Amino acid sequence: PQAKYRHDYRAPDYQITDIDLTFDLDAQKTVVTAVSQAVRHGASDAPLRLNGEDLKLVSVHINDEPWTAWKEEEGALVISNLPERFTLKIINEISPAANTALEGLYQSGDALCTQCEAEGFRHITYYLDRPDVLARFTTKIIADKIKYPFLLSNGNRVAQGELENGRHWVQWQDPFPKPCYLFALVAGDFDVLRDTFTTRSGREVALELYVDRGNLDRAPWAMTSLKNSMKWDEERFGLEYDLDIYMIVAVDFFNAGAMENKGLNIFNSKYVLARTDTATDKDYLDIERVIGHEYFHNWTGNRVTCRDWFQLSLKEGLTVFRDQEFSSDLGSRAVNRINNVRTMRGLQFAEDASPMAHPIRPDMVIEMNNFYTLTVYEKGAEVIRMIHTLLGEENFQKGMQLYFERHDGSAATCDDFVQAMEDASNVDLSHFRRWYSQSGTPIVTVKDDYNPETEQYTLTISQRTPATPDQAEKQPLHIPFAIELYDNEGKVIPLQKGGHPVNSVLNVTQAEQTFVFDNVYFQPVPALLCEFSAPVKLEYKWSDQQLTFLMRHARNDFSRWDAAQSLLATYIKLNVARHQQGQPLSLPVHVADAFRAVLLDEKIDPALAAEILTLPSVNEMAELFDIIDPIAIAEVREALTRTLATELADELLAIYNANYQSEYRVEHEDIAKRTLRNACLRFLAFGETHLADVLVSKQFHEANNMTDALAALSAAVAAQLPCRDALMQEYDDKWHQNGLVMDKWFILQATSPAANVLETVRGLLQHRSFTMSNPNRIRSLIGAFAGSNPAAFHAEDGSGYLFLVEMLTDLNSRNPQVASRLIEPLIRLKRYDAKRQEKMRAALEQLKGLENLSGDLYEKITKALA
Ligand SMILES: N[C@@H](Cc1ccccc1)C(=O)O
Ligand code: NA
Ligand code: NA
Ligand code: NA
Ligand SMILES: [Zn+2]
């Protein structure tokens, strides 16, 4: 497969302004008729190259003339000798039932639906499948009335008819020009939840949410979230919906989360369906996040789109920032900030050290679905947030306004967005642009000094970015470095230099530089990199006492959580080293004291408390080490939980009972008490065994919602409690017919700490509720084993790797996108020890040798083996 380079971008030789599609739908054989008004911009000897994959061409007309001057290669229909303006007509055939990859037009249970981002429209007909070609679509759908009574596409429904032999048709029109990746089609039978939303200027929008028949009782939340998204985008950003109808379809067979198709979002049903006994707080909040996200894409992705795919982060970083803000405005901003920073440090940093490392704007891509990443999405968002941080809300909104004023109705670049922010605000982001071109995690080292003679605090901050596999050259970045100084009473010391205030977000633009603060009337305890003001690793030599001080006194809750993380990090590293020598856990008492103090703080917000009493994931802990010992890490996380459970047993139990809640609400106070309560239950499960077994079994059986029942079920598995097999069996007997709810069960099995976990996982390939035809099922059992049970995936004997290789040999043919997601734990081999590394490389070498090796895996395997 061939690599594409950002620096080869060229405006297309031809444009299409309008396309009229006809679909004669059938799952075995669908006929597509595509009539496209085109224009030649390039030179006359330059042919029209149309992208096309797995299509059966039936005819080619140019202004109704059967055309003889074309050929087919090799993903492409090449048409020669065209005029400056003409009507292209293609008829081709495709086969949805055969589409196991879920790219293009495929079959989701009984329905037919599309997924066209990034390059899936080319699996439907011959087209200029590239997001700098925008056109006005109209879409006619003919089908069997009984099997497909609903026929949907983008925009407004403008015509409809019956035919002989049980067939009907509908025609849709989307008046807004768009790249073909935003095209969508759905056909099938559904229950429909219908409501409306009236925009701040008075436009009444019909809202329609299509779900499998039976599931209307799981739709109101998603509908409520859509309304909330629409309202928030008006309030926060000044943006209103631009169409008369908003459709959302929930489908069970989908590779990602959801797709922002204009006026017709298609959603993985895991981010639509919720009922209090099937779904958790997290589900509810995710449903809110994704509905918001796809909604916010209507401006930051649709009304302004991407000139080319190398610009993905232009809409994803920005649109993620948007879902974060929305979630944060509506809920707890601190809790949101915290989890998003867990994700950055826990997962994204790993990618930015991996062989798949790339800038948020990639320079080279072989298969574009491999670039829907933590880096492009999450770090992308941190980069938007740094722009927010440097500009302030007011100027940020002016940049948004200028972005849209300049680029509405067109396809922009990352640079265009940055130019608009710069131009609207008058802040220079010239150097800041480097965040877009440079990969890897900057490391920021901080060294300080107090001078009591002069009452001055001196900070000497330096930065380096280690070379990455993709880039041998690295330079300093424009790093917004937010600080606060505390005196001995916990009061904030005003920042100043000779007479005048100083903004507390420092501009760290150099390899090394020094900042001097006057009037520091007492040796300060500093809070560094507040609110995670840049996506960097922080090096500063904290004492434990500085950190416990911050946990009591820091003004932002993030800082208090984060200080607790730095307190733990030191002892996680200590105890991994101890595990490696067969010694048991050592933990000074003042650490356990700090956590007792949080459990008993009457005034601390229970949401913050619960995050503090949530130990870093194994994936987070992993980022503390050059070489990862996944077994030591897993065993230490367990030991640390056991120790705290033991020290704090009484406090844990007290806080657990005090936070009991009779009623179940999805409301930020209630979620917070419940999250704290379950954090407590978790430690308790690792305490005294008879009490653990009684508490957990009781909670599972008494629970009136899935959040409480699953926290228990999950503790039973984690702590290997006596009641575990019964509870697991019960859950299965109750929920086996519901795939989404079983995912939770499969994840628990896949992540069990049991000795025979792999063996069970293998057996679960035969489970009634499992199937390899469903990505959600694949992800919850196989993916969760390989990505989320690193102790078992990395067994010394290599069984984890073989298991994955056998699974990937299947999926590479069936569904390369899901395969590529699953391969990721294997391309991290360079982070593990030599013997592990050899086995993993052997596994990658096996997979490289498959016939019909997919481009998706090829890209990762060749990078991982370099
Ligand atoms: N554009 C979708 C994600 C997506 C990409 C590619 C395929 C499927 C889904 C989003 O960001 O929400
Ligand atoms: Na689609
Ligand atoms: Na166009
Ligand atoms: Na809030
Ligand atoms: Zn997105």
- Asked if residue 533 belongs to a domain, the reply is yes
**Are 280 and 344 in the same domain?**
yes
Query: Can you give 408-458 as a three-state secondary structure string?
Result: CCEEECHHHHHHHHHHHHCCCCCCCCHHHHCCCCCEEEEEEEEECCCCEEE
For residue 199, give every residue at least 6 positions away whose Cβ sits within 8 Å of its Cβ, in sequence order, or none: 205, 230, 234, 240, 241
Q: Cβ distance 176 to 159 under 8 Å?
A: no
Instruction: State how beta strands 70-72 and 76-79 pair.
Output: antiparallel
Q: Cβ distance 496 to 489 under 8 Å?
A: no
| Token pair 């796809």 in the structure block, residue | 294
Q: Is the shortest distance between the CB of 293 and ligand 1 below 6 Å?
A: yes
Q: Helices (H) and strands (E) in the chain — how many of each?
A: 29, 34
DSSP assignments along 513-553, one per residue: EEEEES---S--EEEESTT--SS-EEE----HHHHHHHHHH
Q: Would the annotation count 259 as a binding residue?
A: yes
| Token pair 């004492």 in the structure block, residue | 543
β-pair partners for 15: 39
Chain-centroid distance of CA 219 in Å reads 22
Q: Would the annotation count 260 as a binding residue?
A: yes
Q: Which ligand is nearest to the CA of 369?
A: 1
CA angle 109, 114, 119 (to 5 degrees): 135
Write the Ramachandran bin of 99: left for phi over 0, alpha for psi from -120 to 50, otherwise beta.
Answer: beta
Q: Is the shortest distance between the CB of 294 and ligand 1 below 6 Å?
A: yes
Q: What is d(CA 702, CA 260) in angstroms, rounded to the nearest whole number?
A: 40
Which of 439, 461, 488 marks a domain boundary?
439
Q: Cβ distance 311 to 412 under 8 Å?
A: yes
- Asked if residue 808 belongs to a domain, the reply is yes
CA of 836 to the centre of ligand 3 (A): 52
Q: Report which residue type is found at 643.
A: T
Q: What is d(CA 248, CA 259) in angstroms, rounded to the nearest whole number?
A: 10
- Give the active site residues: 294
Q: What is d(CA 850, CA 413) in angstroms, rounded to the nearest whole number?
A: 37
Which residue is closest in CA terms to ligand 1's atom 6?
Answer: 117
**Are 596 and 448 in the same domain?**
no
At 210, give phi and psi (nearest 5°). -95, 125
**Are 470 and 350 in the same domain?**
no
Query: Can you give 227-241 as a three-state secondary structure string?
Result: HHHHHHHHHHHCCCC
| Ligand 1, pocket-test mutation among 115, 251, 259, most atoms within 8 A of CB | 259
Q: Is the shortest distance between the CB of 856 and ligand 1 below 6 Å?
A: no
β-pair partners for 768: none
Q: What is d(CA 445, CA 553) in angstroms, rounded to the nearest whole number?
A: 24
CA distances from 699 to 614, 716, 720, 745 (A): 19, 11, 16, 17
Chain-centroid distance of CA 371 in Å reads 12
3-state secondary structure of 114: strand
Q: Which ligand is nearest to the CA of 118?
A: 1
Which string of b and e fits 411-432 if b means at least 16 CB within 10 Å?
bbbbebbbbbbbebbebebeeb
Q: What is d(CA 402, CA 582) in angstroms, rounded to the nearest whole number?
A: 61
Which has the closest alpha carbon to 358: 471, 507, 228? 471
The four Cα atoms 740, 744, 746, 747 give a dihedral, to 10 degrees, of: 130
**Are 613 and 577 in the same domain?**
yes
At 602, give phi and psi (nearest 5°). -70, -25
- How crowded is residue 58: how many other Cβ atoms within 10 Å of its Cβ? 12
Element (H, E) at 158: strand 156-162
Q: Cβ distance 275 to 741 under 8 Å?
A: no
Q: Report which residue type is found at 848.
A: K
- Asked if residue 4 belongs to a domain, the reply is no
**Which tokens sit at 496?**
């100043």
Which has the closest alpha carbon to 382: 308, 312, 440, 435? 435
Chain-centroid distance of CA 343 in Å reads 9
- Asked if residue 1 belongs to a domain, the reply is no
**Which tokens sit at 102?**
């879920």
Instruction: State how beta strands 264-268 and 364-365 pair.
Output: unpaired
3-state secondary structure of 185: strand
Which string of b and e fits 822-834 if b means at least 16 CB within 10 Å?
bbbbbbbbebbee
3-state secondary structure of 656: helix
Q: Cβ distance 829 to 840 under 8 Å?
A: yes
**Are 126 and 49 in the same domain?**
yes
Please confirm whether the linkage preceding 118 is cis (ω < 30° from 0): yes
Q: What is d(CA 123, CA 103) in angstroms, rounded to the nearest whole number?
A: 7
**Are 807 and 725 in the same domain?**
yes
Q: What is d(CA 570, CA 565) in angstroms, rounded to the nearest whole number?
A: 9
Atom of ligand 1 nearest to the CA of 377: 11
CA of 129 to the centre of ligand 3 (A): 12
**Are 88 and 184 in the same domain?**
yes
| Token pair 């990443």 in the structure block, residue | 373
Q: What is d(CA 709, CA 727) in angstroms, rounded to the nearest whole number?
A: 10
Task: Give residue 154's domain range.
Answer: 11-190
Q: Is the shortest distance between the CB of 372 and ligand 1 below 6 Å?
A: yes
Which string of b and e fits 99-136 if b means at least 16 CB within 10 Å?
bbbbbbbbbbeebbbbbbbbbbbbbbbbbbbbbbbbbb
Q: Report resolution in angstroms.
A: 2.7
Q: Is the shortest distance between the CB of 378 and ligand 1 below 6 Å?
A: no
β-pair partners for 265: 248
Q: Is the shortest distance between the CB of 252 and ligand 1 below 6 Å?
A: no
Q: Is the shortest distance between the CB of 318 and ligand 1 below 6 Å?
A: no
Q: Would the annotation count 293 as a binding residue?
A: yes
| Number of Cα atoms under 13 Å in the Cβ half of residue 177 | 16
The four Cα atoms 558, 559, 561, 565 give a dihedral, to 10 degrees, of: 130
CA distances from 637 to 23, 504, 510, 568, 865 (A): 55, 36, 38, 11, 31
**Which tokens sit at 807?**
């699974």
Chain-centroid distance of CA 208 in Å reads 25
Atom of ligand 1 nearest to the CA of 315: 11
DSSP assignments along 551-598, one per residue: HHH-SSHHHHHHHHHHHHHHHHHHHHHHHHTT------HHHHHHHHHH
CA distances from 283 to 266, 279, 609, 783, 799 (A): 18, 6, 21, 19, 33
For residue 115, give the CATH number of its domain.
2.60.40.1730
For residue 621, give the CATH number of its domain.
1.25.50.10
Dihedral sign computed on CA atoms, order 128, 131, 133, 135:
positive
For residue 704, give every residue at least 6 positions away whose Cβ sits within 8 Å of its Cβ, in sequence order, or none: 276, 277, 664
| Ligand 1, pocket-test mutation among 372, 374, 779, 820, most atoms within 8 A of CB | 372
For residue 61, give every residue at least 6 positions away whose Cβ sits within 8 Å of its Cβ, in sequence order, or none: 67, 87, 88, 89
Q: What is d(CA 431, CA 477) in angstroms, rounded to the nearest whole number?
A: 7
Q: Would the annotation count 796 as a binding residue?
A: no
Which has the closest alpha carbon to 387: 377, 374, 376, 398? 398
User: In terms of residues, how long is the chain?
Assistant: 866
Q: Would the annotation count 340 as a binding residue?
A: no
CA of 371 to the centre of ligand 1 (A): 11
Q: Cβ distance 405 to 356 under 8 Å?
A: no
Q: Cβ distance 688 to 696 under 8 Å?
A: no
Helix axes 589-600, 557-580, angle to 10 degrees: 140
CA of 258 to the centre of ligand 2 (A): 10
Q: Which ligand is nearest to the CA of 117?
A: 1
Write the Ramachandran bin of 529: left for phi over 0, alpha for psi from -120 to 50, otherwise beta.
Answer: left
Which has the closest alpha carbon to 258: 308, 281, 224, 292? 292
- How crowded is residue 790: how many other Cβ atoms within 10 Å of its Cβ? 23
Q: Would the annotation count 500 as a binding residue?
A: no
**Are 44 and 154 in the same domain?**
yes
Q: Cβ distance 16 to 180 under 8 Å?
A: no
β-pair partners for 275: none
Q: What is d(CA 374, CA 342) in angstroms, rounded to the nearest whole number?
A: 12
DSSP summary character for residue 494:
P
Which has the closest alpha carbon to 315: 726, 323, 165? 323
**Which tokens sit at 692?**
């653990």
Which of 521, 541, 561 marks a domain boundary?
541
Which has the closest alpha carbon to 294: 257, 329, 325? 257
CA of 668 to the centre of ligand 4 (A): 9
Q: Which ligand is nearest to the CA of 108?
A: 2
| Token pair 């009136």 in the structure block, residue | 704
CA distances from 32 to 64, 102, 119, 438 (A): 16, 18, 17, 43
Q: Is the shortest distance between the CB of 103 and ligand 1 below 6 Å?
A: no
Which has the closest alpha carbon to 287: 322, 325, 327? 327
- Asked if residue 582 belongs to a domain, the reply is yes
Q: What is d(CA 636, CA 572) in angstroms, rounded to the nearest whole number?
A: 7
Element (H, E) at 279: none
Q: Report which residue type is found at 653.
A: L
Q: What is d(CA 63, CA 567) in angstroms, rounded to the nearest whole number?
A: 72
Dihedral sign computed on CA atoms, order 463, 469, 473, 477:
negative
DSSP assignments along 313-361, one per residue: HHHHHHHHHHHHHHHHHHS-HHHHHHHHHHHIIIIIHHHHHSTT---SS
CA of 331 to the centre of ligand 4 (A): 4
- Asked if residue 465 belongs to a domain, the reply is yes
Element (H, E) at 146: none
Q: Is the shortest distance between the CB of 309 and ligand 1 below 6 Å?
A: no
Which has the closest alpha carbon to 91: 23, 177, 26, 188? 23
Q: Cβ distance 267 to 253 under 8 Å?
A: no
Q: What is d(CA 523, CA 546) in angstroms, rounded to the nearest whole number?
A: 12
3-state secondary structure of 116: coil
Which has the closest alpha carbon to 776: 102, 27, 96, 97? 102
For residue 94, give every residue at least 6 positions away whose Cβ sits within 8 Å of its Cβ, in sequence order, or none: 29, 30, 32, 54, 55, 56, 104, 105, 123, 124, 125
Element (H, E) at 211: strand 204-211
For residue 520, give the CATH number of its domain.
2.60.40.1840
Which string of b and e fits 267-281 if b means at least 16 CB within 10 Å?
bbbbbbbbbeebbbb
Which residue is closest in CA terms to ligand 1's atom 5?
Answer: 117
**Which tokens sit at 264?**
């017709």
Q: Is the shortest distance between the CB of 291 and ligand 1 below 6 Å?
A: no
Which has the closest alpha carbon to 155: 182, 130, 129, 134? 182
Q: What is d(CA 441, CA 82) in angstroms, rounded to the nearest whole number?
A: 50
Helix axes 333-343, 312-330, angle to 10 degrees: 140
Which residue is closest in CA terms to ligand 1's atom 8?
Answer: 256
**Which tokens sit at 28?**
């075995």
- Asked if residue 763 belongs to a domain, the reply is yes
Instruction: State how beta strands 14-24 and 136-144 pair.
Output: parallel
Which has the closest alpha carbon to 784: 755, 751, 752? 751
Q: Which ligand is nearest to the CA of 368?
A: 1
Which residue is closest in CA terms to ligand 1's atom 1?
Answer: 259
Q: Give the chain's domain count.
A: 5
Atom of ligand 1 nearest to the CA of 290: 12
CA of 640 to the centre of ligand 3 (A): 59
Q: What is d(CA 367, CA 439) in angstroms, rounded to the nearest whole number?
A: 19
β-pair partners for 640: none
Which has the closest alpha carbon to 314: 175, 182, 421, 390? 421
**Are 535 and 554 in the same domain?**
no
Which has the closest alpha carbon to 864: 852, 848, 851? 848
CA of 411 to the centre of ligand 3 (A): 10
Q: Cβ distance 178 to 264 under 8 Å?
A: no
Q: Is the shortest distance between the CB of 824 and ligand 1 below 6 Å?
A: no
DSSP assignments along 55-84, one per residue: -EEEEEEETTEEP-SEEE-SSEEEE-S--S
Q: What is d(CA 752, CA 720) in angstroms, rounded to the nearest whole number?
A: 8
CA angle 275, 278, 279 (to 5 degrees): 75
Which has the closest alpha carbon to 613: 631, 632, 600? 600
Atom of ligand 1 nearest to the CA of 120: 7
**Which tokens sit at 300?**
């930051």
- How crowded is residue 844: how many other Cβ atoms within 10 Å of its Cβ? 23
**Which tokens sit at 632?**
């030591």
Which has the closest alpha carbon to 634: 540, 469, 481, 754? 754
CA of 6 to the centre of ligand 5 (A): 21
Q: Cβ distance 865 to 844 under 8 Å?
A: yes
**Are 163 and 180 in the same domain?**
yes
Which string of b and e fits 687-705 if b means at least 16 CB within 10 Å?
beeeebbebbbebbeebeb
Q: Cβ distance 167 to 143 under 8 Å?
A: yes
Q: Is the shortest distance between the CB of 258 and ligand 1 below 6 Å?
A: yes
Which residue is closest in CA terms to ligand 1's atom 3?
Answer: 259
**Are 215 and 301 in the same domain?**
no
Q: Would the annotation count 240 as a binding residue?
A: no
Q: Cβ distance 20 to 35 under 8 Å?
A: yes
β-pair partners for 157: 172
Q: Cβ distance 80 to 70 under 8 Å?
A: yes
Which residue is closest in CA terms to ligand 1's atom 4?
Answer: 259
CA of 286 to the centre of ligand 3 (A): 35
Q: Is the shortest distance between the CB of 262 and ligand 1 below 6 Å?
A: no
Which of 143, 171, 190 marks a domain boundary?
190
Q: Would the annotation count 73 as a binding residue?
A: no
Q: What is d(CA 723, CA 718) in angstroms, rounded to the nearest whole number?
A: 12
Q: What is d(CA 563, CA 560) in angstroms, rounded to the nearest whole number?
A: 5
Q: Cβ distance 646 to 685 under 8 Å?
A: no
| Ligand 1, pocket-test mutation among 117, 264, 311, most atoms within 8 A of CB | 117
Q: What is d(CA 835, CA 833) in angstroms, rounded to the nearest whole number?
A: 6
DSSP assignments along 664-680, one per residue: ---SHHHHHHHHHHHHH
For residue 318, give the CATH number of its domain.
1.10.390.10
Q: Would the annotation count 657 as a binding residue?
A: no
Q: What is d(CA 677, CA 653) in angstroms, rounded to the nearest whole number?
A: 9
Q: What is d(CA 335, CA 209) in angstroms, rounded to the nearest whole number?
A: 30
- How crowded is residue 238: how many other Cβ atoms within 10 Å of its Cβ? 13
- Asked if residue 139 belongs to a domain, the reply is yes
| Token pair 């970045």 in the structure block, residue | 477
Q: In angstroms, how far is the first alpha carbon of the chain from the final one?
A: 17
- How crowded is residue 200: how many other Cβ atoms within 10 Å of its Cβ? 12
Element (H, E) at 728: helix 724-735
**Are 248 and 316 in the same domain?**
no
Q: Cβ distance 61 to 88 under 8 Å?
A: yes
Q: Is the shortest distance between the CB of 117 and ligand 1 below 6 Å?
A: yes
